[PDB]
């Protein structure tokens, strides 16, 4: 394929032009005074949304070089979403502000490599300063406050989360599913969650969540890599019988057997999912047999001689419900006797004392907490059906925020956290003049999130940002009420984790983009 | 796919241009002095119609951005149709008037978010003012008056509706079907109606009721989500013996199970209809069993161990007819024993009296109201079939209006109801100047429906609207006779429900469209 | 000639586009942080200047309609210059801000005639409020302060003005000419100044002032309108003998006599100029004899029997310098007599002893105030013809500032005077909503001069204007030092007259331009 190549200044202006389209399409949806962005669909009515992720996903430009620019900063928005779930628009407004001001310096005739190091040092210092500004959420009374304001002043939502975290702990696994009737239910059932995602994106069946949800799915467990589907068939054929989906945990299922499972599921023939096993090597083999007893199935490995050809349904585990993130797989209520699991539990409790090491201890406790710790199931209750399904997603986006509120804490919202960090790093310097500007680029980029919220509110961003900088602490601007004051007292707050993710990722890409000299793409 | 993105003022003018096409094509058919709109078809003769829905459906513009605008306000027209069945043209004329005047303010330099809140507050106040202006229809003598004038001064139509409502009640289920002979018949047969419509559009046979219609159909009842059709087959091709259509009521009907049922009804090879089971969860199973008894069939569940691959024709329920709208499904004549149905009467009669929880008593009544409350059936008769048809249609074209006349009442027609509300909300104010204009935009939009009817009548709208505002009460303009007077006395009236729907929906979309800053569509 | 005609919105956007070119070309030169504008000349080097008048004069657009717009606001800049000599840029920045915001309202759908009345009422109130904010200059100590700061902190300049005003008075006539040597000289010589302009703008020899100037000149005086040169030859033929310029003061100079003298001075064959006879009718005939006695010549009129043919050298009058503005003739050091002037005065003062009417008195008083009041003359003195020309240049301009400082006073500079008036008229209302916006347009236009100065200074105008509004009084922003403080104490001040002229004129044109619906121009 014939290629087009652009160099230097010529190449960069095409990126800036490209990112500016994606940014300006997203930055308009920032804050509560945000604007609607309409996205066209071929089938019927257009989609009107404020969700910065949905808008970002749709952007793809005509000019191949511009497209690259745009597609580069898009990779950040989506990754910020993967880290926290929040702050995708806040990431993108930052990224733009670093790139626009960054490239200005490069064009002025400054060393890009010194500019990158200036930005990254300013960021590493900003993350460090941010941890100091963070107000932790320890007790289950302050945890309830975060879940309430995140779900639009709903006290019923925050009460459930606090009760769920009081059962499984702060490290425990909490999941939300559809309710049975009129009252919110809460049970702790035997389940497990491990840190591996879906094997391919086309496994999804949730129109919005980007998730794979399977009701009463049988579980196949394979220690060996599956290349050909020629081995899976005898199992797969018995899973079509008694039409219930299939979950494949293995070392790997990649190459041929994956694509044939993608062709099938999407065509409609049997709902299936594939997921890489947790961990690696010797500690994997154990974890898998842990799932196996908990899910009531049996492991199949080439090591003893058990091949998938001769694999009936007892080898297959049963679970009540499974959910698969982009980066996580989780199970709810597997079959497996009270004893059967708690028996395997003690078989790891012995291993705590028998093996004398530093690292070997951790893995055993991170296994027993997944397995004997349990899983929290909150079933939402309302009167009419559409009042339940609306109260469902409300809890889900009020949980993700609470999760981040526990791990790193909550900083002052309204983009004031960053603008407060900015004034506290004014004395920060690099090694040479070029690095010094690199810092000032990053510090002037931290003002942009606030400035963008004010712009949507109709007020002059310059005036408001200047007033917030003059006052000290958690004093900021409420765009909803057009009133100044203490942000924490006004319920305006952002989880520290989301703001840390938004800044770090946005700097990471800008750093790579500032050091760009050559672009190679396909010919129009 | 490469995308085109437009921002701000540039993006909005394409919407306005787009909505103006759909609006101007529809607003010409308003009132009785309305004009004909001709719609082209590839096969043979063009369709000449005044129906604002039929005209709206056909509009789809070339310019992708314009198309979006047009397709946005179309959603409303169709949704107003879903709420009432009337006032689709009245909705669209309103929507245009809010958008055109709204965007004018945005372009002047006013906050869209404040303009939206100004409109919505003016609307919430207008709905509240509308309820006060409403004249209720309580007794069955005033109910007969509404059915008479809605069917073009036909007294035979209004008499049947009043007799039907005197049998099953105001909450009762009333259905119209083809007559047997020369006299109008009225029986109450064992049937039920639940708040679930067709699961896919492609089930529609005749697009007049906008519904599925099945003669002598079997019914299947199962409390499970249908994965694959490799479960249905032994039943589907069992109903094909003796040759009759089938009804499918399952938790859901998704995936391959859905699409292959679609392909089989469409191509003719046995006609089936997929509808959800009503309510949810625990009273999902309960409300479904009610139907099983009513139909003389059986239930196939998840807990017990009953699968589809062993249900004979005996295991199926049966009916004389089923009517399936978008949000509705109603059954007629259940082959179930006269005692077995009455046995479930006692099985709910024991539940009401023995209820510790205060909520059950409410919905248990809403179970016997659909079971022992009944279903009324009117068979319209004449000497010629060409007047059996024409008279059959005249009853349904009077029932939908009577339904709304009972639920919320009837206001003064001629678009005077809204113009009367307009003068009564002149003192309404918001929080800032921008919100204040948002209200005045909505109030000047309420004048448009009347103004549009007068425009079709050839008279100057400005003069007539000014005369109607000067006088008070139910004093309006009769466009048919070119005479002023009391609207109620002249038989010109609109169901409160339709006018409330027309205003609310039209404001809802305008609100979303005013807050639009970015549009993303496919490249030409 | 074939014409092009544009109507309404189409016609207005061409004006706005047109004024925006002239405004943006001038507004960049506002304040002391102003930018340079380069003007091209066909002959040699381009002219680099900051003078808002020189820039305005040069603007003339290609698009005939755009040109009209631009040429309309240009008429104001030049007229502000005619009133004060200062504030031409400040006028233009105001005019733009009223037009831009004005037309926005017209396009929104508001009555132009109500918008004009709203602006004019806001202005009449602003001029009234401005008189209250003015700090008068009464004593000759505070008069010296104004002449010092206007001439770039030069105390020698301010000392001369104060000494000149102590001789002839505040109403007295003061003129500046070239010096003889090394010290500044000050004499009071027998002269007079009256209020008429030149008949041709092509008589102007020194364009920098925009004025006519003749050394040791001859003078004609005639109570008759001159139309033919056949009456003029034997006069003009005598002028080349004794090589010196000529000044005609006749009733009027018409058609031929005009076009003769205008072109026949371009050639360089006899420099001349012609101005209208001061006053009218009866008071016309005397004022001329005054001049004749003042100069030492004689008058010539058809009334008595005096023809223009036998007008010799002695019938002509002699001064030592005559200066003519757009609207200001001034005869300096007329070689009359001791006994003739003292005689004519003691005669005119006897007329007021026999004063019959209140008014007849006044115009007689004002007539000796001219004749017996004399003219003060200042001969600037410095080393070489480089600092002599420069000092004279700072004097002329500062005198002009001191003149206005006496008549109306001095307000607080930095454009704060207007922005202070703006906050004090916030409660001002009109008769209807459209008039109310007309006022708010004018009040937001008063902020622009300050905002434009800050823009040139590089600082954000929004931030600075917001800070000036918060504080009260003569507290403003110094753009030269980037410091806030009391403007009067910092020497930053504007003569009230100039700010009054700048506002009134800018509103006058904007008012006319807002009420424009049709434009007629020549075809391209
Ligand atoms: N009342 C408020 N006033 C000012 N800022 C607010 C207010 N409420 C929330 N915010 C800020 O809103 C910002 C978040 O904007 P969002 O619209 O959530 O975009 P995002 O989080 O970047 O991405 P999405 O769209 O959530 S996936 C947070 O940083 C809050 O500080
Ligand atoms: N004689 C009349 N004079 C004035 N208005 C009338 C008269 N008769 C009916 N109307 C008004 O006609 C309006 C309804 O217009 P329609 O043409 O029915 O449009 P629509 O109801 O919005 O949608 P369709 O076309 O019925 S689906 C009602 O609001 C009546 O108030
Ligand atoms: N140090 C200063 N800081 C801020 N404003 C100043 C300062 N010095 C002068 N000004 C303002 O400068 C404004 C005048 O700008 P100029 O450049 O003189 O334009 P103008 O007077 O409109 O027209 P010209 O160019 O003089 S004919 C006055 O209103 C002063 O208030
Ligand atoms: Mg967010
Ligand atoms: Mg209708
Ligand atoms: Mg000046
Ligand atoms: Tl957003
Ligand atoms: Tl299972
Ligand atoms: Tl606002
Ligand atoms: Tl219609
Ligand atoms: Tl049947
Ligand atoms: Tl008519
Ligand atoms: Tl200037
Ligand atoms: Tl004063
Ligand atoms: Tl002379
Ligand atoms: Tl500066």
UniProtKB/Swiss-Prot annotation, chains A, B, C:
It catalyses: ATP + H2O + a folded polypeptide = ADP + phosphate + an unfolded polypeptide. Keywords: ATP-binding, Chaperone, Cytoplasm, Isomerase, Nucleotide-binding. ATP binds at residues 29-32, 50, 86-90, 414, 478-480, 494. The keyword Signal does not apply. It comes from the Bacteria. One of its GO terms (biological process) is protein refolding. It is found in: Cytoplasm. Its EC number is 5.6.1.7. Coiled coil: none annotated. The keyword Chaperone applies. GO terms for cellular component: cytoplasm. One of its GO terms (molecular function) is isomerase activity. PANTHER family: 60 KDA HEAT SHOCK PROTEIN, MITOCHONDRIAL. Belongs to the chaperonin (HSP60) family. Forms a cylinder of 14 subunits composed of two heptameric rings stacked back-to-back. Interacts with the co-chaperonin GroES. This is Chaperonin GroEL. The gene is groEL.
